[PDB]
């Protein structure tokens, strides 16, 4: 298209507010290398690893393009105005392009690296988009669109699982080649767009409510239904089996009849940032929350939409409830908290059980009076669905993902991701990109044998990503000022979500998008 | 219509695939007796049953066309090319008829059976369009079309049961008359016909998911997420609490962040199929899954769809857990194992949990440091719907049932009928066939007493049922061949789904529909 | 189509001659039992048979008809017309027809035998035109139309072999219901047809 010396394509990295949508746009720099050698190897777990940890699959040659994350497509201060204001976001379409493809070819001859440009090389890209290969997006892996629009990233290799009876495979274990797709082959000069549109996805709620489930009512007029207040009265010197009602009002405003329920609960263990108040065991697994598949004992991370704490109580979290984001320059095993930020889901404690914390109590026995039996109950650590039911979904985040794709099941219930974010039955596809195989000086004598030796290459260019995204305006009638997110004023060695001496940029804290309230 | 002498059908037993689409056309010869020597009977659990078997109901004379069973429309070919060529299939519409229709009057004369024409006589049909009466199809009932196309069948007789305390009726029984119903009067020579046409209904998952629910991210690359990985670190010559976090990656691949749940769990018993390995106690019902309803216990059987078996444990099943289908020639009650044939659910073991083990593990208390309480879990024998919850439906066989109607309620979840099959809220009406009783000789002077003698009669004639269903065509991209349904190329002594020496059709062994594969 | 007292066809046995042609008419009586008592019976060879004498197979409850002789269409005084006056001669299209069907209901009680008709009953009758059975026609077997127009001839009873390991049978053997096949159901008073053509072949060299 543009042969050698003319530009595919040019920088577009902005953001267009108009009225209900925000269109943001983001361009990066990427370096692909080659993987793997040009091969699919078969991977899995390795000999003696434990039966949760087994797994089989396969590496591919292939990248593929993230950017399933709101830092991908957001600045902080279009966070700051996206948050602040609306009730509700929700992708709508989205636009991508490779542009200005540079194949780079590296060789070493007696320990120099001299790298020259290959103006005839190829980079095959194809986006799945009838969905045929495993979904690997909506892991929350690394290697998406760096948040900061000059970081130069590397892409990351493409791979899958498939089903495994162990560190072995079964018959029904799949395998898939990447070069058995259509692939659109790209010279220095060709370009590569295509668009996608979002399905309808409920907007993401943006608010924290300012009532309480069970505080509903109307504090000033009294109820006209009864409630059992009383079981026995003073009967001479001892007590005797007498039902008493009553009313119930602000006074005994526990025992008012509600139509609704809090949502459903999965039991998180309580841990606490202050180190001291943790117990002095290794209990990270043994008391972690899990779940059982085909007998192999899966960690519950993030889990069902629950609170992180109850009033006052701030240091407590789950062990396993929250999304945990790590600070600029973290390593990867065994980090301590300072190096981390933890997630706080406290704005929905109005309608969803505290993680760590029982959903209620339910009778376990009949009682009965003369021989007798008092009435028992039990803490309910684990609680479905039931009729009547009201809860909020996880709150999503500047560094956190934005959607997920709806396993293809029989059925499911709310297919809101676990993580935060946007279900999709049909999202964004992946999008797939390798280099082209250059085979080396073959030989002059015919061999049958497959080409083992290639020349090494590179390919490097721009990556852009536009979203349309619509708003739910707020229109509150609240009298006093809302919670908004804002900057501290005093003063700072560095300012926060910028570049420091050494030119790093990094993320100070999580923010999350519920700071306007709206009433239950 | 056609008097006596004119055929009013033909034969039509065949399937046309004609695209997206079977046309399956099934002939069966049927014999109707006299039920109940046309009277309606009320009928009642006999005293000293147990109080789980109480039942209140009615008997009628009239009896019912039963073809709710797949082996009724697909021959065991037909059944091979649906389900190893498409992922997915769903009825569409029905054409019922009834035709050639003989009344046959029997004598007994001094020990001898003689039977004649009776040309004038009629037979009563009528379809329960409206569903004013109890439907008891789906209800896994004998009775249905044989699946060899040259049997002969008996029409079962049809009854209901009512509200009963006890072996009492109350108020609230209702009692149906069907001679109160519109109903079609045929002599030899007249036909029946009706079409009906099948709501809405999911296309029935007949392929096994290739990954596991567990297993759907990235080998390659690790999260951006944390997680607790440690809580305490060697300090001095003791430990001392430490939290820790990492991220995950392969090695640690059963901590990784996760979108979504495996499906509800109802947890059944594990038996196995080697009796030495069972315990040597009658446990049918003491160690059965029961659900209690109205101070009765009923057996939870299939109950919600869940995996027979982990890897490497065929022998194991729930107690009552899957379909079990009986051989030819099996007796009722109290038949060995290698009598009866033992569906498997292992191919939804990727989404559903194991049927014998528990959901997974919660949080029980609150850990805490210095007393110190250590965190403690409980294993999940039951759980609920979840908000992000996935799961697969029970499996169709060719022996198993195709539909049951929805119950009249407010609410349900998920109706899908856990025998296996399509929910309709308006399924196939029933259609309900009598022979009009025709009075014996009357006394030449009047009587007010109802008539009590009648011409012993029965019928017999032919029943056409067409079916057209849509196919869901497999568009998998995966390179290596997949798991498909074959015949056993060994020699052996009988061809499997054909007659033996004594033309006796048997069925070998269940077929389900689940051997394509399909990514979550 | 004629209920019952009215006739469902004529008898035509006859031959024109008509320049290069010669159209043969043959009308017979049939009688068709009931076989296998209405069931279908794998059938296989005995133990000790030699092993060229091995076979293995079905045997089903319906009969057929077979005209696959030329005695079924040719007197004697036709067939030396013929022969005598023609250099060759080959099939051009048949036609077929079933009329007059009478099902007759046999009882016997003691020791008697009672045969009474059943106006009610019918005949399933459906031609194989798409070869998805196997033909077993042409295997010079007995059951055609008699040659004598005035003989009464039994249906003779269909059955197929299959693939066969010995007496036993192997996963390729193939299994036909011939009830999974459309066919036509007649009572007394109905009558069924089809016409056929034959394919282009070589005339048959009637000389030397």
Redesign the interface.
Known sequence: ADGVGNSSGNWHCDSTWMGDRVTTTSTRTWALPTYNNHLYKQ?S??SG??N??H?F?Y?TPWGYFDFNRFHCHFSPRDWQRLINNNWGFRPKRLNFKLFNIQVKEVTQNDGTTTIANNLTSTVQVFTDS???????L???????LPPFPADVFMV???????????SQAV???????LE??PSQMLRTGNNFTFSYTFEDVPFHSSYAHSQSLDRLMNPLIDQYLYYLSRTNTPSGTTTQSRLQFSQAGASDIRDQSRNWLP??C??????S?T??????????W????????????????????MASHKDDEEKFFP??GV????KQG?E??????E??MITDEEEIRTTNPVA?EQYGSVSTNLQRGNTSRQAATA?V???????GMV?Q?RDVYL?GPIW?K??????????????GGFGLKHPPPQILIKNTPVPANPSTTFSAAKFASFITQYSTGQVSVEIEWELQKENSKRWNPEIQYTSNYNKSINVDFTVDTNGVYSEPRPIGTRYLTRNL
């Not at 999965?266 to 841990?271: A, D, S």
């Not at 650590?381 to 009729?387: D, E, F, K, S, Y």
């Open positions: 991977i777990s390795q690893a434990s949760d940890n797994y699959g590496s009838e969905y045929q290969l495993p979904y690997v909506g892991s929350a892996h690394q290697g998406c990351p290799q493409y791979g899958y699982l498939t089903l495994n009876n162990g018959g029904r274990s799949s395998f898939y080649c058995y797709f949502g459903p999965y039991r998180q263990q309580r841990v940032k180190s001291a108040d943790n117990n002095n065991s290794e209990y990270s043994t008391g972690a929350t899990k779940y059982h598949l085909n007998g192999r004992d899966s960690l519950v991370n993030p889990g069902p939409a062990q396993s999304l945990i984001f790590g973290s990867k095993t065994n980090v301590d908290i190096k981390v760590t803490d650590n684990t609680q479905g669905v039931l009729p809860w979904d560094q997920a709806i396993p293809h099941t029989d059925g499911h219930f709310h297919p809101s991701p676990l993580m």
